């Protein structure tokens, strides 16, 4: 029960959760052979489950893949809080021209793209049809790769899940901040939330990749969720404007995609999440004051499989009549968590 970087560590029952469905969840993960490295559940500010796999400890980091997109959006949010980024309708082109060193053929046809359009994965650049889309992972300059395609659909109208759009969003951040993604994060988000043992893929150009490449501790993923849960406040420090969060969670071109994050529902009520391939999640449930964090290596199932499983059992934990603290229940809980660790 020793507090962990601000967080009280408690039994599910201490936060009005039945531990039994959480034990069943953890057992089901094991016996279905699901490679879940971390599963953290926070409720009412208390860390009620902290499940690590064999070899994984509190201080290990994990590739978070598309969770990186949400971090990118958060950093733009911070620029908005600081007043530097006034308006999501400003053309991305203003930032591209200001950065410079970008040949005109990369810029041609992109004069209408708004920051909103790239945040929404709605640039109109058909990333899904761009044969060299994987080059953003290895090229000298990811921004150059992001600018190779032409704008074909009216910006803001067509959803196409794109690392290129994330990178164009990051260009706005670079121009307005004077810093790369990681540089700005270390001045702001990562400093303010006391992140530890993070790493972010840095291309030869010095630019980070906006859509992927960040590695984080699960506890740091949890803090990112807390920041949104508390409407842009972390431990009494204002970091995001409420208006920014409101816009960020509003569906754009896709009925379920805001500013580099997904909307969802739990108990019929609006929720939202960062997520990444292989089943990485930062899942925020405002009406229950909960954040759920997951890192995994599940490559043979869609990410909704693990998400739905977790949410089913969390619902059972909330609805259960059996919420009394009983030594037998503590032991089965602690023993299952131990087993998962082996």
CSV table of C-alpha atoms in Angstrom, one decimal:
chain,number,residue,atom,x,y,z
A,1,UNK,CA,0.0,0.0,0.0
A,2,UNK,CA,3.1,2.3,-0.3
A,3,UNK,CA,2.0,5.3,-2.5
A,4,UNK,CA,3.5,5.2,-6.0
A,5,UNK,CA,4.4,8.7,-7.5
A,6,UNK,CA,1.3,10.4,-5.9
A,7,UNK,CA,-1.0,7.4,-6.4
A,8,UNK,CA,-2.5,5.5,-3.4
A,9,UNK,CA,-2.4,1.8,-4.0
A,10,UNK,CA,-5.5,-0.1,-2.7
A,11,UNK,CA,-7.7,-3.1,-3.1
A,12,UNK,CA,-10.6,-2.9,-5.7
A,13,UNK,CA,-13.0,-3.0,-2.7
A,14,UNK,CA,-11.5,0.2,-1.3
A,15,UNK,CA,-12.8,1.9,-4.5
A,16,UNK,CA,-16.2,0.2,-4.5
A,17,UNK,CA,-15.2,-2.5,-7.0
A,18,UNK,CA,-15.6,-6.3,-6.5
A,19,UNK,CA,-12.2,-7.8,-6.9
A,20,UNK,CA,-13.6,-11.2,-8.0
A,21,UNK,CA,-14.3,-10.1,-11.7
A,22,UNK,CA,-10.9,-8.5,-11.8
A,23,UNK,CA,-9.3,-11.8,-10.7
A,24,UNK,CA,-11.4,-13.6,-13.5
A,25,UNK,CA,-10.2,-11.0,-16.0
A,26,UNK,CA,-6.5,-11.6,-15.1
A,27,UNK,CA,-7.0,-15.4,-15.2
A,28,UNK,CA,-8.7,-15.3,-18.6
A,29,UNK,CA,-5.8,-13.2,-20.0
A,30,UNK,CA,-3.4,-16.0,-19.0
A,31,UNK,CA,-5.5,-19.0,-20.1
A,32,UNK,CA,-6.3,-17.4,-23.4
A,33,UNK,CA,-2.5,-16.8,-23.9
A,34,UNK,CA,-2.9,-13.0,-24.3
A,35,UNK,CA,0.4,-11.2,-24.2
A,36,UNK,CA,-0.7,-8.3,-21.8
A,37,UNK,CA,2.5,-6.7,-20.3
A,38,UNK,CA,0.7,-4.2,-18.1
A,39,UNK,CA,-2.9,-3.5,-17.0
A,40,UNK,CA,-3.5,-0.6,-14.6
A,41,UNK,CA,-6.8,0.5,-13.3
A,42,UNK,CA,-7.3,3.8,-11.5
A,43,UNK,CA,-10.6,4.8,-9.9
A,44,UNK,CA,-11.3,7.9,-7.8
A,45,UNK,CA,-7.6,8.6,-7.9
A,46,UNK,CA,-6.7,5.2,-6.4
A,47,UNK,CA,-4.6,2.6,-8.2
A,48,UNK,CA,-6.8,-0.5,-7.7
A,49,UNK,CA,-5.0,-2.9,-10.1
A,50,UNK,CA,-1.4,-3.0,-11.2
A,51,UNK,CA,-0.9,-6.2,-13.2
A,52,UNK,CA,2.6,-6.8,-14.8
A,53,UNK,CA,3.6,-9.8,-16.9
A,54,UNK,CA,6.7,-12.0,-16.5
A,55,UNK,CA,9.8,-9.8,-16.6
A,56,UNK,CA,7.9,-6.5,-16.6
A,57,UNK,CA,8.3,-4.1,-13.7
A,58,UNK,CA,6.9,-0.7,-12.9
A,59,UNK,CA,9.9,1.0,-14.4
A,60,UNK,CA,10.0,-0.7,-17.8
A,61,UNK,CA,8.8,1.3,-20.8
A,62,UNK,CA,6.8,0.0,-23.7
A,63,UNK,CA,6.2,0.9,-27.3
A,64,UNK,CA,2.8,2.6,-27.4
A,65,UNK,CA,2.5,2.9,-31.2
A,66,UNK,CA,-0.5,5.1,-32.0
A,67,UNK,CA,-0.9,6.3,-28.4
A,68,UNK,CA,1.9,8.6,-29.7
A,69,UNK,CA,-0.7,10.4,-31.8
A,70,UNK,CA,-2.6,11.4,-28.7
A,71,UNK,CA,0.6,12.7,-27.1
A,72,UNK,CA,1.2,14.8,-30.3
A,73,UNK,CA,-2.4,16.3,-30.0
A,74,UNK,CA,-1.8,16.9,-26.3
A,75,UNK,CA,1.3,18.9,-27.1
A,76,UNK,CA,-0.6,21.1,-29.5
A,77,UNK,CA,-3.2,21.5,-26.7
A,78,UNK,CA,-0.5,22.8,-24.5
A,79,UNK,CA,0.5,25.4,-27.2
A,80,UNK,CA,-3.2,26.4,-27.2
A,81,UNK,CA,-3.2,26.8,-23.4
A,82,UNK,CA,0.0,28.9,-23.7
A,83,UNK,CA,-1.9,31.1,-26.3
A,84,UNK,CA,0.7,30.5,-29.0
A,85,UNK,CA,-1.7,28.3,-31.0
A,86,UNK,CA,-4.9,30.4,-31.1
A,87,UNK,CA,-6.9,28.6,-33.8
A,88,UNK,CA,-7.2,25.1,-35.2
A,89,UNK,CA,-8.5,26.6,-38.5
A,90,UNK,CA,-5.1,28.2,-39.4
A,91,UNK,CA,-3.6,26.7,-42.6
A,92,UNK,CA,-0.9,24.1,-41.9
A,93,UNK,CA,0.9,25.8,-44.9
A,94,UNK,CA,1.7,28.9,-42.8
A,95,UNK,CA,3.8,26.7,-40.5
A,96,UNK,CA,5.3,24.7,-43.4
A,97,UNK,CA,6.5,27.9,-45.2
A,98,UNK,CA,7.9,29.2,-42.0
A,99,UNK,CA,9.9,26.0,-41.2
A,100,UNK,CA,11.2,26.2,-44.8
A,101,UNK,CA,13.7,24.0,-46.5
A,102,UNK,CA,10.7,22.2,-48.1
A,103,UNK,CA,10.8,22.2,-52.0
A,104,UNK,CA,7.7,23.7,-53.6
A,105,UNK,CA,6.5,20.3,-55.1
A,106,UNK,CA,6.0,19.2,-51.5
A,107,UNK,CA,3.8,22.2,-50.8
A,108,UNK,CA,1.8,22.5,-54.0
A,109,UNK,CA,-1.9,21.9,-53.5
A,110,UNK,CA,-1.9,21.9,-49.7
A,111,UNK,CA,-2.8,25.6,-49.2
A,112,UNK,CA,-6.3,24.7,-47.8
A,113,UNK,CA,-5.3,22.1,-45.1
A,114,UNK,CA,-6.3,23.4,-41.6
A,115,UNK,CA,-4.7,22.0,-38.4
A,116,UNK,CA,-8.3,20.7,-37.6
A,117,UNK,CA,-8.2,18.6,-40.8
A,118,UNK,CA,-4.9,16.8,-40.0
A,119,UNK,CA,-5.9,16.3,-36.3
A,120,UNK,CA,-9.1,14.6,-37.6
A,121,UNK,CA,-7.1,12.3,-40.0
A,122,UNK,CA,-9.0,14.1,-42.7
A,123,UNK,CA,-6.4,15.7,-44.8
A,124,UNK,CA,-7.7,14.2,-48.1
A,125,UNK,CA,-4.3,12.8,-48.9
A,126,UNK,CA,-5.3,9.1,-49.2
A,127,UNK,CA,-2.4,7.8,-47.0
A,128,UNK,CA,-4.0,4.3,-47.3
A,129,UNK,CA,-3.3,4.5,-51.1
A,130,UNK,CA,0.2,6.0,-50.9
A,131,UNK,CA,2.7,3.3,-51.8
A,132,UNK,CA,5.6,4.7,-49.9
A,133,UNK,CA,3.6,5.3,-46.6
A,134,UNK,CA,6.0,3.0,-44.6
A,135,UNK,CA,9.0,5.2,-45.5
A,136,UNK,CA,8.0,7.6,-42.7
A,137,UNK,CA,9.4,5.0,-40.2
A,138,UNK,CA,12.9,5.0,-41.7
A,139,UNK,CA,13.4,8.1,-43.9
A,140,UNK,CA,15.8,10.9,-42.9
A,141,UNK,CA,13.0,13.4,-42.6
A,142,UNK,CA,9.4,12.1,-41.8
A,143,UNK,CA,7.9,15.5,-42.7
A,144,UNK,CA,9.1,15.2,-46.3
A,145,UNK,CA,7.5,11.7,-46.5
A,146,UNK,CA,4.3,13.1,-45.1
A,147,UNK,CA,4.2,15.7,-47.8
A,148,UNK,CA,4.8,13.5,-50.8
A,149,UNK,CA,1.1,12.6,-51.4
A,150,UNK,CA,-1.3,15.1,-53.1
A,151,UNK,CA,-4.6,16.4,-51.5
A,152,UNK,CA,-7.3,14.5,-53.4
A,153,UNK,CA,-10.4,14.6,-51.2
A,154,UNK,CA,-11.8,17.9,-49.8
A,155,UNK,CA,-10.0,18.3,-46.4
A,156,UNK,CA,-12.2,17.6,-43.4
A,157,UNK,CA,-14.5,15.2,-45.4
A,158,UNK,CA,-12.8,11.8,-45.7
A,159,UNK,CA,-11.3,9.8,-42.8
A,160,UNK,CA,-8.0,8.0,-43.6
A,161,UNK,CA,-5.9,7.0,-40.5
A,162,UNK,CA,-2.6,8.5,-41.4
A,163,UNK,CA,0.9,8.9,-39.8
A,164,UNK,CA,1.3,11.6,-42.4
A,165,UNK,CA,-1.5,13.7,-41.0
A,166,UNK,CA,0.0,13.3,-37.5
A,167,UNK,CA,3.3,14.5,-38.9
A,168,UNK,CA,1.7,17.6,-40.5
A,169,UNK,CA,0.1,18.3,-37.1
A,170,UNK,CA,3.6,18.1,-35.6
A,171,UNK,CA,5.0,20.6,-38.1
A,172,UNK,CA,2.6,23.2,-36.7
A,173,UNK,CA,4.0,22.4,-33.2
A,174,UNK,CA,7.5,22.7,-34.5
A,175,UNK,CA,7.0,26.0,-36.1
A,176,UNK,CA,5.0,27.6,-33.3
A,177,UNK,CA,7.1,26.2,-30.4
A,178,UNK,CA,10.5,26.4,-32.1
A,179,UNK,CA,11.1,22.8,-30.8
A,180,UNK,CA,10.7,19.3,-32.0
A,181,UNK,CA,8.0,17.0,-30.4
A,182,UNK,CA,10.3,15.5,-27.8
A,183,UNK,CA,12.0,18.9,-27.1
A,184,UNK,CA,8.7,20.5,-26.4
A,185,UNK,CA,7.4,17.5,-24.4
A,186,UNK,CA,10.5,17.8,-22.1
A,187,UNK,CA,9.9,21.5,-21.6
A,188,UNK,CA,6.2,20.9,-20.9
A,189,UNK,CA,4.1,17.6,-20.6
A,190,UNK,CA,6.8,15.2,-19.6
A,191,UNK,CA,8.3,17.6,-17.1
A,192,UNK,CA,4.9,18.7,-15.6
A,193,UNK,CA,3.7,15.1,-15.2
A,194,UNK,CA,7.1,13.8,-14.0
A,195,UNK,CA,7.5,11.2,-16.7
A,196,UNK,CA,10.5,8.8,-16.3
A,197,UNK,CA,12.3,6.4,-18.7
A,198,UNK,CA,10.5,7.7,-21.8
A,199,UNK,CA,12.2,7.4,-25.3
A,200,UNK,CA,11.0,8.8,-28.6
A,201,UNK,CA,12.2,7.6,-32.0
A,202,UNK,CA,14.3,10.4,-33.6
A,203,UNK,CA,14.9,10.4,-37.4
A,204,UNK,CA,18.3,11.4,-38.8
A,205,UNK,CA,16.8,14.9,-39.5
A,206,UNK,CA,16.3,15.4,-35.7
A,207,UNK,CA,12.4,15.2,-36.1
A,208,UNK,CA,10.5,12.7,-34.0
A,209,UNK,CA,7.8,10.7,-35.7
A,210,UNK,CA,4.4,12.1,-34.7
A,211,UNK,CA,2.3,9.0,-35.1
A,212,UNK,CA,4.4,6.3,-33.4
A,213,UNK,CA,7.8,5.8,-31.8
A,214,UNK,CA,7.2,6.8,-28.2
A,215,UNK,CA,8.0,4.4,-25.4
A,216,UNK,CA,6.4,5.1,-22.0
A,217,UNK,CA,6.0,3.6,-18.5
A,218,UNK,CA,2.4,2.4,-17.9
A,219,UNK,CA,2.2,4.7,-14.8
A,220,UNK,CA,3.0,7.7,-17.1
A,221,UNK,CA,0.3,6.6,-19.6
A,222,UNK,CA,-2.0,6.7,-16.6
A,223,UNK,CA,-1.0,10.3,-15.8
A,224,UNK,CA,-1.9,11.3,-19.4
A,225,UNK,CA,-5.3,9.8,-18.8
A,226,UNK,CA,-5.6,11.7,-15.4
A,227,UNK,CA,-4.8,15.0,-17.2
A,228,UNK,CA,-7.9,14.6,-19.5
A,229,UNK,CA,-10.1,13.1,-16.7
A,230,UNK,CA,-9.5,16.2,-14.7
A,231,UNK,CA,-10.4,18.5,-17.6
A,232,UNK,CA,-6.8,19.7,-18.2
A,233,UNK,CA,-5.5,20.0,-14.6
A,234,UNK,CA,-2.7,17.8,-13.2
A,235,UNK,CA,-2.1,18.0,-9.4
A,236,UNK,CA,-3.3,21.6,-9.4
A,237,UNK,CA,-1.5,22.8,-12.5
A,238,UNK,CA,-3.5,24.0,-15.5
A,239,UNK,CA,-2.1,22.4,-18.7
A,240,UNK,CA,-5.0,22.2,-21.2
A,241,UNK,CA,-7.9,24.5,-21.7
A,242,UNK,CA,-11.4,22.9,-21.2
A,243,UNK,CA,-12.4,24.2,-24.6
A,244,UNK,CA,-9.5,22.4,-26.2
A,245,UNK,CA,-10.5,19.1,-24.5
A,246,UNK,CA,-14.2,19.6,-25.6
A,247,UNK,CA,-13.0,20.0,-29.3
A,248,UNK,CA,-10.5,17.2,-29.0
A,249,UNK,CA,-13.2,14.7,-28.0
A,250,UNK,CA,-15.8,15.9,-30.6
A,251,UNK,CA,-16.1,13.5,-33.6
A,252,UNK,CA,-14.6,14.9,-36.8
A,253,UNK,CA,-14.7,13.2,-40.2
A,254,UNK,CA,-15.1,9.8,-38.5
A,255,UNK,CA,-18.0,9.5,-36.1
A,256,UNK,CA,-15.5,8.1,-33.5
A,257,UNK,CA,-12.3,10.2,-34.1
A,258,UNK,CA,-11.4,13.6,-32.6
A,259,UNK,CA,-8.0,15.2,-32.3
A,260,UNK,CA,-5.8,12.1,-32.6
A,261,UNK,CA,-7.9,10.1,-30.2
A,262,UNK,CA,-11.0,7.8,-30.4
A,263,UNK,CA,-14.4,8.2,-28.7
A,264,UNK,CA,-16.1,5.1,-27.2
A,265,UNK,CA,-18.9,4.4,-24.7
A,266,UNK,CA,-19.3,2.6,-21.3
A,267,UNK,CA,-22.6,2.2,-19.6
A,268,UNK,CA,-24.0,4.1,-22.6
A,269,UNK,CA,-22.0,7.2,-21.7
A,270,UNK,CA,-19.3,9.0,-23.6
A,271,UNK,CA,-15.7,7.8,-23.1
A,272,UNK,CA,-12.5,8.4,-25.0
A,273,UNK,CA,-9.1,6.7,-25.5
A,274,UNK,CA,-5.6,6.8,-26.9
A,275,UNK,CA,-4.9,3.5,-28.5
A,276,UNK,CA,-2.3,1.6,-30.5
A,277,UNK,CA,-1.8,-1.6,-32.5
A,278,UNK,CA,-1.1,-4.8,-30.5
A,279,UNK,CA,-3.7,-3.6,-27.8
A,280,UNK,CA,-2.2,-0.5,-26.2
A,281,UNK,CA,-4.7,1.7,-24.4
A,282,UNK,CA,-5.3,4.8,-22.3
A,283,UNK,CA,-9.1,4.6,-21.7
A,284,UNK,CA,-10.8,7.4,-19.8
A,285,UNK,CA,-14.3,7.0,-18.2
A,286,UNK,CA,-15.3,10.5,-16.9
A,287,UNK,CA,-18.6,9.4,-15.2
A,288,UNK,CA,-16.8,6.7,-13.1
A,289,UNK,CA,-13.5,8.8,-12.5
A,290,UNK,CA,-11.6,5.9,-14.1
A,291,UNK,CA,-8.5,5.5,-16.3
A,292,UNK,CA,-7.5,2.1,-17.7
A,293,UNK,CA,-4.0,1.6,-19.1
A,294,UNK,CA,-2.9,-1.4,-21.1
A,295,UNK,CA,0.3,-2.4,-22.9
A,296,UNK,CA,0.4,-5.6,-24.9
A,297,UNK,CA,1.8,-7.6,-27.8
A,298,UNK,CA,-1.5,-9.1,-29.2
A,299,UNK,CA,-0.8,-9.3,-33.0
A,300,UNK,CA,-3.4,-12.0,-34.0
A,301,UNK,CA,-6.6,-10.2,-32.7
A,302,UNK,CA,-8.1,-6.8,-33.3
A,303,UNK,CA,-7.6,-4.4,-30.4
A,304,UNK,CA,-11.3,-4.4,-29.6
A,305,UNK,CA,-11.0,-8.0,-28.4
A,306,UNK,CA,-9.0,-7.2,-25.3
A,307,UNK,CA,-10.8,-3.8,-24.7
A,308,UNK,CA,-14.2,-5.4,-24.7
A,309,UNK,CA,-13.0,-8.2,-22.4
A,310,UNK,CA,-11.6,-5.6,-19.9
A,311,UNK,CA,-14.7,-3.4,-20.0
A,312,UNK,CA,-17.0,-6.4,-19.6
A,313,UNK,CA,-15.2,-7.4,-16.4
A,314,UNK,CA,-14.9,-3.9,-15.1
A,315,UNK,CA,-18.7,-3.5,-15.5
A,316,UNK,CA,-19.2,-6.7,-13.5
A,317,UNK,CA,-16.8,-5.3,-10.9
A,318,UNK,CA,-19.0,-2.1,-10.6
A,319,UNK,CA,-22.4,-3.9,-10.6
A,320,UNK,CA,-21.5,-6.7,-8.2
A,321,UNK,CA,-23.3,-6.9,-4.9
A,322,UNK,CA,-20.1,-8.4,-3.3
A,323,UNK,CA,-18.0,-5.4,-2.4
A,324,UNK,CA,-17.1,-6.2,1.2
A,325,UNK,CA,-13.4,-6.5,2.2
A,326,UNK,CA,-12.8,-10.2,3.2
A,327,UNK,CA,-9.3,-11.6,3.8
A,328,UNK,CA,-10.0,-14.6,1.4
A,329,UNK,CA,-10.8,-12.1,-1.4
A,330,UNK,CA,-7.6,-10.0,-0.8
A,331,UNK,CA,-5.5,-13.2,-0.9
A,332,UNK,CA,-7.1,-14.5,-4.2
A,333,UNK,CA,-6.6,-11.1,-5.7
A,334,UNK,CA,-2.9,-10.8,-4.5
A,335,UNK,CA,-2.2,-14.4,-5.6
A,336,UNK,CA,-3.6,-13.9,-9.1
A,337,UNK,CA,-1.5,-10.7,-9.5
A,338,UNK,CA,1.5,-12.6,-8.3
A,339,UNK,CA,0.8,-15.4,-10.8
A,340,UNK,CA,0.5,-13.0,-13.7
A,341,UNK,CA,4.0,-11.7,-12.7
A,342,UNK,CA,5.5,-15.1,-13.2
